[model samples]
Target chain A: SCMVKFELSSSKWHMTSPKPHCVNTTSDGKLKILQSGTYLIYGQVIPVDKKYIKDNAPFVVQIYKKNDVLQTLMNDFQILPIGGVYELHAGDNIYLKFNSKDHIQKTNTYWGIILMPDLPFIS
Target chain B: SCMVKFELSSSKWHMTSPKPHCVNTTSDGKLKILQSGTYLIYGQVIPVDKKYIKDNAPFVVQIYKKNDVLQTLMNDFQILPIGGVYELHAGDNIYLKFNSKDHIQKTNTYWGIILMPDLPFIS
Candidate 1:
């Protein structure tokens, strides 16, 4: 199994590659799966700056499958550390986006994915 | 591979076990891993009421490997949706603990784990 960790800091993305792991990403922020299987995708965010927290502007963390069109994994929820599972395939372009009504600091959030065992249908 | 989802509400913990999955828990809030491998652990928490949120009490979501002593997977951070990857073996006792200076609602939090493909080092 492979694991991928991505960080959004300074308005850019940073990725960590584990040795012998097959997951990789593109310059445009697309995480490409090299093996088909079920995966655990998770994200978390804490509002930066006291002023932004008081504004209470809505925030969202979401996963999108980028193909001919975009497919959302789940409804947007305003909670930290949202986790879900999905059956994904090789060559699938997956990525995460975080939105907030106010300025967000890179030090305040995290995004990641983990590859799980394949289902019986997969050889 | 297995998946375990747990919830805390009204001062109680609720766990969801998917069929064909081997993970289980005890009344003492311990998650027992029956099969050994690397797993993804995640957790999230949102404050219940406006008053509690306004208090700005430090909130923590933590994973503890319960052995002779508690081992922390990561240092406390204030962000929601924190996640990490860990290499664990069978018979390991795992559990999540949330500490907040104020009250927390069951509907405001989630904890989960997903088993990944075993490392080749395992038989």
Candidate 2:
């Protein structure tokens, strides 16, 4: 019932737009959780090859609900982008897991999930 | 009337807990802005003396509203944590500016602001 929609970098150079019905993703990227409450999960990955920043590596932006591991949120060492305020429901299967210890090929990632409205709820 | 509230690391190791009447601080730090609208600014810093990571320098987590700096989000080079979604009004004086080219002391930063609930507004 409340959403701001965003899901880019299906594999690179993003923001093509068009994909807003509460933002669902499947076909190997799983990000489907229509509506329940508090959400504002975000992700950012940037490294257009510099040898993955001379192999500083280790990048993660995770949140898995239906499968457990509810929040890794951006395990650092490199790529960054993190925002928290979570409490999901309805079907729950939020996903945006990008872990890199190697394998760099023009990445400037961004993953989003926004659905906020209600009054104050922070923890 | 909408805010999540956070202003820590007045200089280090924080989360003492108390301030949250829509958080306001000023002594040299400046984080006024009581009520406006969209805000989800966040910041994170982690570097407890490693020679500031061999002088990788530059750590910024900024958002200055009334004085005009809109959003720096989280500059780069080190220390990570960034979130976006900003739109402010009402007296606007949002502040959380930390710039580090050096100074590393048990650093593990966190700065926040949350206010959202009005359908959808993102740019």
Candidate 3:
């Protein structure tokens, strides 16, 4: 279970709101490594600041292979309150969006992500 | 020509203000790579938000070999200004401080670092 969450600068969002943030494969078509036993996944939302994060919106993380979506880790406004850290499992990707919000704004920059490795098996 | 600037969340700063932000060797005692022909260096200051950056402060990046300071890249308040991106060279390490500022405060968590690779020397 190699899970990751991300925090990024807002200037990088090339799309409008009501959109999705998806995971991408590395140049070699392989997932990035989060840890020795963990692989990097994508599809995480650059979370919003609590005071400014919109409500009723949902963020998602979508997993893919060969450029096709495989699964999604969905987190609604209720789940991602303001700013928080989330995890990504190996082979997992995610997306972000607010189907309910209108156009996004500036100051919607900056985010934090975390990658959690799987639990070790106790003999 | 490998360089990186960081922007981080505010909850991670654990040291004092006049302290230094140095880079530690990886688990293998190897410097982290910032890019091909490029290596990651530490000693950067988590910049203060525009409305907050103090004046006359200085930041530094120090390079190391076997845990000894090899070289240092220093940036003063006039050089850093407010919050902005800076570049780091390969085999560079750094330290941060505001000899002029008083006690360090909270709201000093998140940060972002960029690693710029070497120029191809475009033939």
Candidate 4:
């Protein structure tokens, strides 16, 4: 399954792939893909956002390509997560944004993007 | 330049970037590298281990390359973590193995490996 599960208070977000689709979320919430190898983009975020867990604010989970931010992945500022290995261009529209605006507990939050098999990156 | 960090009560692991080294701890603890791009490996683990936090035991964080096992990335079993993007070479030897040893809390653990600034994957 090219997984997709979202809930920030259920504003509707769903996309489960398994048919010529690398990964898609055409509801325009983000995450777009078609075909381009070596992909393994990932996701994570879990902040109830009450003054950013009450101090030292830094629980970011960003992996964006709609405005450029592509890396921050982890700070362990409470498991704000990420998984890298990115390069997707068949019209690349990657997404998984977070900064928090209140609630976020989508079952501990889940995210996906996988396509790594014919490996050849740097040797 | 390279990067490395470890804690589970130090069997001795230390590799701090920059050199003719790409990442090393040849003390046989793990984490072997030497110039191989597309790398962006990350890590996480913070389980005081007492039967998986008193219920539903599953805090596995494995990303090994020693005996076949390369991805469990994240399960969020209490911030047991991971960050992706891999394609290392130059006699590759990766590490970040976990299944539980009854005591894991090296200040919430840490891990690293980064080399990505010339991308090309899935397009």
Candidates' lDDT values, in order?
Answer: 0.54, 0.52, 0.30, 0.55
Flag the better candidate by TM-score, 1 or 4. 1
lDDT of 3 by residue, B6-87 (tens): 3232223221122223332222223333232222222223334434654545443333443555444333221121222234
TM-score of 4: 0.34
DockQ of predictions, in order shown: 0.10, 0.06, 0.02, 0.05
- Candidate 1, residues A14-120: lDDT per residue as tens digits? 33333435556554545777777777676555446555465444454556776443322221223245455667777787876555535345565556567755332
TM-score of chain A of each: 0.63, 0.28, 0.29, 0.29
**What is the lDDT, from 0 to 100, of the residue A69 in candidate 3?**
56
Could you tell me how far off, in angstroms, the CA of residue A31 lies in candidate 2 after the best superposition? 2.6
Rank list by lDDT? 4, 1, 2, 3
Question: Which ten residues in a row are the worst by lDDT in model 3 chain A?
Answer: A76-85
Writing each residue's lDDT as its tens digit, candidate 4 over B1-123 gives: 344545445554444333326766544346777676766666566667455466654556667766667665444344455755567876678876666644357774655555544422221
Check candidate 1 and list the clashing pairs. A80-B81, A81-B80, A81-B81
lDDT of 2 at B64: 77
**TM-score, ranked from best to worst:** 1, 4, 2, 3
Per-prediction RMSD in angstroms?
9.1, 15.0, 14.9, 12.9
Can you give the lDDT of residue B29 in candidate 4?
Answer: 46
Q: Which residue ranges in model 3 land beyond 4 Å of their true spot? A: A1-87, A99-101, A105-123, B1-123
Highest TM-score scorer = 1
* Preferred candidate (lDDT higher): 2 or 4: 4
Highest DockQ against the true fold, candidate: 1
Q: Write the per-residue lDDT of candidate 2 for residues A1-123, one digit (tens) a residue.
A: 334434344432122133445556554445676657766665554544444355554555555777777656433344456656677877788765556534323334455566654434333
Error of 4 at A49 (Å): 8.9
Spell out the clash pairs found in candidate 4.
A36-B122, A36-B123, A37-B122, A83-B84, A84-B84, A84-B85, A85-B85, B1-B18
